[PDB]
Design an enzyme around this catalytic site. Structure first.
Site, PDB file in Angstrom:
ATOM      1  N   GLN A   1       4.740 -22.707 -35.675  1.00  0.00           N
ATOM      2  CA  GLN A   1       5.115 -21.453 -35.029  1.00  0.00           C
ATOM      3  C   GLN A   1       6.175 -21.682 -33.959  1.00  0.00           C
ATOM      4  OE1 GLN A   1       0.681 -20.332 -34.393  1.00  0.00           O
ATOM      5  NE2 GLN A   1       1.729 -18.351 -34.563  1.00  0.00           N
ATOM      6  N   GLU A   2       6.053 -22.774 -33.203  1.00  0.00           N
ATOM      7  CA  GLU A   2       7.050 -23.071 -32.181  1.00  0.00           C
ATOM      8  C   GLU A   2       8.422 -23.279 -32.809  1.00  0.00           C
ATOM      9  OE1 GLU A   2       5.971 -26.376 -29.720  1.00  0.00           O
ATOM     10  OE2 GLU A   2       7.668 -26.076 -28.355  1.00  0.00           O
ATOM     11  N   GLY A   3       8.471 -23.963 -33.953  1.00  0.00           N
ATOM     12  CA  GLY A   3       9.736 -24.141 -34.644  1.00  0.00           C
ATOM     13  C   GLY A   3      10.318 -22.832 -35.142  1.00  0.00           C
TER      14      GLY A   3
END
Ligand SMILES: *[C@@H]1O[C@H](CO)[C@@H](O[C@@H]2O[C@H](CO)[C@@H](O)[C@H](O)[C@H]2NC(C)=O)[C@H](O)[C@H]1NC(C)=O
Length: 492
Positions: free
Chosen positions: A158-160
């Protein structure tokens, strides 16, 4: 033209956010990292009613014309055993936001608290304890829209994705039509015929090589044909399919993004893994029977990944191994090949991880962290990457005597960001960068569409910007589809 205008607009349109304008709305995101926590206030004007347009989200600007940001240390993960104590640790951040956001808009302003690596490695039982203290405590002290879904530990995938959304948003790649100057791609929406393909602005992938990890994220426009049902099981976990628009029935903003993170494949981590094998191999017969055993300074291991004539040493388990740099860039690349952990499986990059095919002839990437430090800090060629120009400059730097490099460092020849660690490990990291890129991820040597950079439009990439943009993606439904959801009154 339009790129220069957008480039010029973002740099000069810094006028303070008009808190007196009732048509501005606000949103708050807290990045809860390992080393600390940061809060960002974003604002946007009313949506223009066009279903094809996203919100015009921007960082809020204070009276000094600065981004509304605050940071605190040491992070939320430290309270793994003190969950009751956590709500007071983030209090300085929320009071900061409550000051800038008008009191009248707090009730309509969402608050998102998203935690990354610090909370990921805690026991799941303790993760839930922290979120619950925030969920039960904040609503009483603040009027922000805050619910169970608003406090969450996001995955690295999700961070990516959020970071990928952030960069493409500021680059205008979600602005559709008027792609007259920009490049376009043919897209196959997941779960739709090949003749239902659409044409929209090409997006920009992101390459990020940190100290410990290397991350890669890019869009997969074309339908993917997997070789094995098992391969698809792996790819499922590395592919994200989402919709940035407000209409769940439209496909213009449906994207398939591949995200992969490689722990232990950053520049510094690679160097440590390399030194570990030099140390371990001391008792190999070839090392013992030669004159590069490394046990005393007079018989040092000749490391091609170090600048010429530098003297370094490895200390481990109380022992010491002595090295001397021979500054051989091409020989360094061959030596560090094994540490990419490549397998013979097709469609795999580092560590045998699956990688969807990249349309190299029609693609573009940004390179962050070491991709910029290894091209700019000493070689002084950050920006558009060119393999030939890079390998030549990288080779020449490594073949330069350590004393000469050291003398130039003292005279201030290199970037003010470069320290002695950069001067010493530039060679290894430049070669590691080159190999991860061209044989790890298999980018052609002649690839012309990589740009290494530290920021975009003179601003850091905020993955929190992609988060707020994704979480608020339905708000335009208010202005647009008021009629679609009108209450139906019944005559009983
Ligand atoms: C690169 O691959 C090597 C193996 O080829 C990994 O080393 C192994 O790691 C496991 C831990 O899961 C150990 O149980 C093995 O004993 C290790 N083998 C050797 C020969 O050292 C290594 O972890 C991989 N590197 C990264 C960064 O993933």
């Amino acid at each position: 033209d339009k790129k220069f205008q957008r480039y010029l607009a973002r740099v000069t349109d810094i006028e303070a956010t008009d808190t007196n304008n009732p048509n501005v709305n606000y949103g708050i995101v807290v990045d809860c990292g390992s080393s600390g926590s940061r809060v960002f206030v974003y604002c946007w004007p009313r949506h223009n009613g066009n279903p094809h347009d996203l919100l015009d989200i921007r960082q809020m600007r204070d009276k000094n014309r600065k981004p509304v940001v605050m940071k605190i240390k040491p992070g939320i993960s430290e309270f793994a055993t003190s969950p009751e104590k956590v709500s007071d640790y983030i209090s300085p951040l929320l009071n900061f936001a409550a000051e800038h956001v008008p009191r009248a808009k707090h009730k309509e302003t969402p608050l998102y608290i998203l935690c990354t690596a610090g909370m990921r490695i805690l026991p799941e039982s303790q993760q839930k304890a922290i979120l619950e203290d925030l969920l039960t405590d904040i609503p009483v002290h603040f009027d922000f829209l805050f619910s169970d879904s608003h406090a969450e530990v996001i995955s690295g995938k999700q961070e990516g994705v959020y970071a990928w959304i952030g960069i493409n948003f500021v680059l205008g790649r979600f602005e559709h039509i008027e792609d007259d100057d920009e490049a376009v791609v043919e897209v196959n929406i997941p779960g739709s015929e090949s003749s239902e393909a659409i044409v929209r602005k090409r997006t920009a992938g992101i390459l990020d090589m940190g100290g410990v990890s290397t991350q890669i994220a890019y869009e997969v426009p074309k339908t993917v044909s997997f070789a094995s049902s098992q391969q698809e099981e792996v790819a499922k976990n590395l592919l994200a399919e989402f919709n940035l628009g407000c209409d769940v029935h439209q496909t213009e903003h449906v994207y398939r993004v591949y995200v992969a993170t490689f722990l232990g494949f950053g520049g510094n981590a690679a160097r440590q893994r390399y030194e570990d094998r030099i140390f371990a191999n001391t008792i190999q017969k070839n090392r013992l029977l030669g004159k590069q055993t490394g046990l005393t300074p007079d018989m040092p291991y000749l490391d091609p990944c170090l600048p010429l004539d530098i003297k370094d040493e490895i200390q481990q388990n109380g022992q010491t191994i002595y090295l001397r740099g021979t500054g051989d860039f091409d020989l360094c690349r061959e030596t560090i090949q094994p540490f990419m952990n490549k397998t013979n499986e097709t469609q795999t990059s580092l560590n045998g991880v699956y990688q969807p095919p990249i349309h190299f002839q029609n693609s573009e990437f940004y390179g962050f962290s070491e991709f910029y430090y290894c091209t700019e800090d000493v070689l002084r060629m950050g920006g558009d990457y060119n393999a030939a120009k890079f390998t030549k400059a990288a080779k020449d730097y490594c073949a330069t005597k350590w004393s000469i490099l050291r003398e130039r460092f003292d005279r201030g020849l290199y970037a003010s960001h470069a320290d002695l660690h950069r001067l010493k490990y530039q060679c290894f990291k430049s070669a590691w960068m080159f190999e991860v890129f061209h044989r790890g991820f298999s980018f052609p040597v002649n690839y012309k569409s990589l740009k290494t950079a530290l920021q975009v439009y003179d601003k850091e990439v905020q993955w929190t910007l992609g988060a707020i943009l994704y979480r608020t993606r339905f708000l335009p439904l208010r202005d647009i589809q008021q009629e679609a959801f009108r209450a139906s009154h019944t005559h009983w």
